[model samples]
Target chain A: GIVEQCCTSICSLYQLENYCN
Target chain B: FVNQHLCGSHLVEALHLVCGERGFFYTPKT
Candidate 1:
């Protein structure tokens, strides 16, 4: 079985923050 | 603000990330 769950929100937050900088 | 729509929507896991023109999530020190 494939588990498709993890800390997605935080990763997005980090990535987005980086891009805007 | 429309430029903000270019991020990958499927990124998940880990707390360590190195960002650039893209983002890189690294293995955590456990």
Candidate 2:
């Protein structure tokens, strides 16, 4: 068995608030 | 007007947090 779901929104976790927004 | 991308330790700081969180997530090998 392997992973089936995940979160791809990486930039959201960054501190780049301007970029994230 | 100065068009520049100003940044500091924010990147490094975020990197540490990301790594600590398994790069944030994982996907299936489909």
The candidate maximizing DockQ is 1
TM-score versus the correct structure, for each prediction? 0.17, 0.28
Task: Indicate which candidate wins on lDDT.
Answer: 2
Where is model 1 more than 4 Å wrong at Cα? A1-21, B1-19
Across residues A1-21, which tens digit of lDDT does each residue of candidate 1 receive?
011222322223544343332
Model 2 local distance difference test score? 0.32
Q: What DockQ, on C-alphas, does every prediction get? A: 0.11, 0.09
- Which pairs, if any, clash in model 2? none
Counting only residues 3 or more apart in sequence or on different chains, how many pairs clash (N, Cα, C under 3 Å) in candidate 1? 0
Q: Report fnat in order of the candidates.
A: 0.02, 0.04
